[model samples]
Target: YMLDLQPETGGGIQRTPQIQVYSRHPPENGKPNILNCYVTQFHPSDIEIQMLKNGKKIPKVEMSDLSFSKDWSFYILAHTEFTPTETDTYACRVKHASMAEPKTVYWDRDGSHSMRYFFTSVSRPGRGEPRFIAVGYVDDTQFVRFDSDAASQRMEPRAPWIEQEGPEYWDGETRKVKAHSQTHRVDLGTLRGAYNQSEAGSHTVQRMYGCDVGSDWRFLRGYHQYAYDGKDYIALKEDLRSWTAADMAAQTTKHKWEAAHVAEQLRAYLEGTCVEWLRRYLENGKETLQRTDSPKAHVTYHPRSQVDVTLRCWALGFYPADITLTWQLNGEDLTQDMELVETRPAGDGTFQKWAAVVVPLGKEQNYTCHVHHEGLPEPLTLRWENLYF
Candidate 1:
């Protein structure tokens, strides 16, 4: 059911609501947790919100009573409790007049299961360390690796389970990666010719490929790309089983790889072998990899001038690295002139971020900082006074 509140809203200023999807606690497989979807700062409160599991509406979702600000903008919270699993996807779907279509935000944007592999080859001509190196990551942890040095030239395990696989797995990886190192060395020299660089100049070539699998073992996407001298070179076009060259030089490599049917094989590995490896890695490291940590936030005010102040909300010590922070004035979001930076690693394994907005000095009490993260039971709303004491 929809109602026209525009007439009552005085000539209609429709402010689109912002949505956040998160778990009350850091999510763990086989553990029960609360899933919350918060929608705020919208005018004309007519909206539809749903909690979804595996793309279907979850039953028994509880919606909060309609709440409003002095500006008549609205806020609503929808939540449900469920036991998380490795293969179930959770999301929030919102429909509002301001949106052209229903918006769906997944609890984990990168997918529940993922695997990534990176290869780098440097043409230094002479080197102290390895000129070539490769790393394999399962989820967010490094699991397998190889480097082209005299003492550590073989593919090896960075995690325990990989070590448990014995020499057979390592032997195969060593062979494969060694082949890759040699191929990349030759390709780097060829690329130097393509770029018209001198034979003595150092250059670099990098390759990255991965796959993301969502709930129910669904394949979300696969990616394979290459870069030369830190610039885009060529990439695989998954849908058409082809290669996309970034420039004239890259076109030559793309045509060569396409003629060799490399894209077909890479696609097979990305969807098949990559997914299976991610599944195996998850099962092996669930003790550590499946654990989640919540975040803490605080609001602070700094006097920028006699008549103006800057309010900042800092969130820290959170895992998964996805968070939402905003400044609200009188219950409506303060969008213009907000300073926000990308979430960055805290260097101790967690992540941190902050957002700042300027307001009138005397009006500090009217502004609030809001933070949403997977580690909190509910969205946090803090004002300057909350931190003063």
Candidate 2:
């Protein structure tokens, strides 16, 4: 599959970019699939194709002077058997190899730039008949809409679709179709589009044959990681101020001492969780060479007499619906008298499920969140707080 971007309106001294994508090989041929890129008005000598996974470049392909047209569009072709994963971004650099670096022309949602780019994915056919699945962002919420025609007939409302106050309605329209079991097949022709009547009141129209379905579907792995410098980490630190501020104000002379102690403890907790996550990733044989550059762990600690610690383990390229979390103490499962929370979808086709295991003051316990994904070499186990007092 290939996507071509052409300049529509705005054109001037600013680079007016156009794109042409060619498959690695002829369709149905077992030959390696290659992508050739061409952009207009850009120096063919400087053009480069950067294949990226989760916003990070994996490899680079340089363009050749061979031009299909005299419009200054360059061509670069490369081959690969793997398909682009869900929500993966791919683009071509007209004058720069690295898009992140300084560049006069670039492609963005605003479409006021030079680079010619579009998101691409190769979907292989799965078991049973071919079905269409639409995945994208809507109202800041992630949604997966596919033709459930085969499954629609079998769908019958198992329960009332949860309803909330306001103009937004969650009628059992699709749920009703999902209730039926005999209709295991979901036909894209039946459920083609959907309407959202929220405050934003947006209408979503999905492409019928946006991509093909194949049985050899493999979701890319190791494209993202948990960052200690992220906004979520900053927000969490602010929430911990109540505990740390009191510790510092009590003795100004001991301020440095207090800060050092707190920082050390937090660092330990962060490193511990990160090591645990990496161990699990390695056990699954999925740890990549990119780990040296990715931030894989985060930590936040309380400084009160009864210090409370929170550790987060993050990774990308796995389906959110399949993750599971649990709490353990002293090498045994601690299910009694513990408040266990349910895992919820992060609305981005990824899961953001967490578990909190609390222990008494001056005491310690071990907590773990086990994540399972079919794409991983093995299950990922993250230990939140397992340190001794």
Candidate 3:
């Protein structure tokens, strides 16, 4: 009687990766055959790549390219310099989800393959933009949205759906590009290919959510790091940013879960209401949306006792949101001595920011500030001079 060596994959499904070890590192002076191992098309592919020296697992793995295929699987690279002799066994170790066992794929340097691999898998399977639109309103509106987090407007009455809101995100591939929508917000619905969604009313809240899927039946992570209207409250750890796929795996666990519930609550509330309340709120009064204008600057000095001179730069009334304030000293760029804080926005659809720096009262150093704006062909350069007492 054969004992059935079987184990369960908690949310796991087996899809072995295609292993191909190549000698493909750019040829170094003495580098003939670089040990480049490629793991391709592995499902739930958060697998591992290992280097074996004479049947011994290497401690340090200098990793290279790690990415995915169009088929929705993943590929990873583990590489090292050349090794001689076909006798020593070098393998790519893959630990995957949905396997009754773990497996190892080894290379013999001479294009020989072996079944020394097993599959009691330490497994898992896995898996841009926002536009603000408020039409048919009080005609008065502020196109705004929130990303990552949320909260309620104090000006609004007791609202069921608003909680200055969480931790919710994904760590895998984008499986579905879709509308997590319902006609009223609770009922799942979609219309494509010459279809129509009843106008998400002035009162209707249009909400969407996205997540990552690692493999067949493998959903690794989900995220709430976006908004159509653009209010970004929770700045998650950069890993959660999803800008780089490598950084997507790890996230603040607590934040991720809480975000799901928080955003879910708000989505639930938007179900029946046309969500016109939001439009009403945004268009409550007159707002002039404009671009960032050229900034203003001035020079001031401390008292004789203080013995320090200062320069202050102000940028007010800009729009469309890319404003940079740069400080130059002595005709060269010395941003180190020039401290600049993050920028801030102003009311009525324009942007304004401030930066102040202290300089020596006695200096032949020429300090100039260069400001960049969308409206200006050349950067607006302002010079700082000493003020008379």
Candidate 4:
């Protein structure tokens, strides 16, 4: 294969890990705090995750099926729920054969934005702060996605961990924290304002929390939605609308004591209070929105009478804004030869996206558009029709 001829560059075939958390809606009385911990992209899948409180360990209440990376890495979701207080402590300790020791991580609730940085160094704070993090700050925004199949591939450490490169935005929507699948995909902060609060889309009143231990530890939690605007829209946190650059720098300080203390508050909100409030508001049509519809995909092909021929894929009427479309020519998958537009929000709470490509002329061609989404029972494939014929 063309890839086998390539020499490993930068850090070749090293083991690396990344962690993220998801909070489920609160159940009626007599129910437990529902949470999920996603431990992803780690080599030597032989691993152990420990849930704890105030330095005490808890059992693996539940976990999801394993998810494998094309690169031989592995991922899984650990779940649990229980009573919690704003002042109690909780943690996730990850142990893998590749690790010299188990890694312990948490959240810091100070207004300082570690969300932009992976909390690899054990620093961060509160409501506005996301702690379950692998903190990093890289103007470069480019990093290896670090995947390899069944091999000892790599990238770690403590000392206020930070990624020298990362993406600018976070996906509060999926809470998958994915901005770019290869970069520091998940962020605890950034545009969390877009998801932390209750959206009509839909969570819990428990102090229950999910802890991720992997390549990084970035924690996420929510506020009570008391942004100065009170109600127009779950208002923006003051830290968001009112902080200066240095103020931000000060907040992200690596001071252990402060970082840890602020983390205490962050823990409270992220696991203790925030999810509870989000559930009260979001589950009832505030921050969470449920979709009961499928998407319609269409195409517009342009046989430019002059230069390049163009074919576009259009997705319409999809809910929750998560969708993917690909271009295929004569059964061959194409990438560099195509152009894709960003996914856009439809006025009616649905989504839309476009993908285009240049095809050779003077010959009959068969082009297909493939779409993938959670709502669809199967992949939606559309063929371009040249009506001009």
TM per prediction: 0.64, 0.24, 0.32, 0.36
Candidate 1 regions with alpha-carbon error over 4 angstroms? 1-111, 126-130, 238-240, 328-336, 372-381, 386-389
Full-model lDDT for every candidate: 0.70, 0.29, 0.38, 0.41
For model 1 the local lDDT of residue 244 reads 81
Best by lDDT: 1
lDDT of 2 by residue, 299-337 (tens): 223333455544334433234234444555666766564
Model 3 C-alpha lDDT versus the unseen true structure? 0.38
| Better structure of 1 and 3 per TM-score | 1
Candidate 3 residues 233-319, lDDT tens each? 122222333221112211232244344544344333232122333322223321332122444434333443357666666565555
Q: How should the candidates be ordered by TM-score, best one leading?
A: 1, 4, 3, 2
Q: Tell me which of candidates 1 and 2 scores higher on lDDT.
A: 1
Displacement of residue 36 (Cα, Å) in model 1 is: 33
lDDT of 2: 0.29
Clashing pairs in 1: 294-375
What CA RMSD would candidate 3 show?
Answer: 24.7
